[PDB]
Ligand binder design. Structure first.
Ligand SMILES: [Ca+2]
Length: 223
């Protein structure tokens, strides 16, 4: 997250870190057994880390639970990032508590202009590299479809939305991928892509979770 703020320990209790020997992507806990992340975060060999604040210190509220299964969306296209969504099943259910909690799936799609909370352990610099240890947060508004398409001509599908600031300075970034965009208390987006981070006229692009609720529900009813 570039231009964000330190969230505060466990104030984003649905945020997970995906670890394959190191943090590599975020995700969102949607119930005690299942995480939503980005399909481009697929790796074999994922441990889900819940209850994290500093990802490099064991502070006492973590649960580390291996994945048993990962399910990339059946229509994921890694070239265009259309349908950039994946489900990860935990080998054992998390113990839900004040620091490890699920986020609701949406009923309606969020609206242009809504301010959402985006979070992660990704890079904090637009130019160069600096990875935080503690979770960072950013409030960013959803941009209109038309503004998103102008920023990325020929690249935005109906399964994507843009959020952020066309002046630059505030955005998600590498290492935030797969993490949450929460609007009105529900999971509306997944950190997916963008041209650099926090650059002018190049806002973040996010997987539009409301288009996937029926896939998510039928998949978790079956696995
Ligand atoms: Ca920790």
């Amino acid at each position: 997250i570039v231009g964000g703020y330190t969230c505060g320990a466990n104030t984003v209790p649905y945020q997970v870190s995906l670890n394959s020997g190191y943090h590599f992507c975020g995700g969102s806990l949607i119930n005690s057994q299942w995480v939503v992340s980005a399909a481009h975060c697929y790796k074999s060999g994922i441990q889900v880390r819940l209850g994290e604040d500093n990802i490099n210190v064991v502070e006492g509220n973590e649960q580390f639970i291996s994945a048993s299964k990962s399910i990339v969306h059946p229509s994921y296209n890694s070239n265009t990032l259309n349908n950039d969504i994946m489900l990860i099943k935990l080998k054992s259910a998390a113990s839900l508590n004040s620091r490890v909690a699920s986020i609701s799936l949406p009923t309606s799609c969020a609206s242009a202009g809504t301010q959402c909370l985006i979070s992660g352990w990704g890079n904090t610099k637009s130019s160069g590299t600096s990875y935080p240890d503690v979770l960072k947060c950013l409030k960013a508004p959803i941009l209109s479809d038309s503004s998103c398409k102008s920023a990325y001509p020929g690249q935005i599908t109906s399964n994507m939305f843009c959020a952020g600031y066309l002046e630059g300075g505030k955005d998600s970034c590498q290492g935030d991928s797969g993490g949450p965009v929460v609007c009105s208390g529900k999971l509306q987006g997944i950190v997916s892509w963008g041209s650099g981070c926090a650059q002018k006229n190049k806002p973040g692009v996010y997987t539009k979770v409301c288009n996937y609720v029926s896939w998510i529900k039928q998949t978790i009813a079956s696995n």
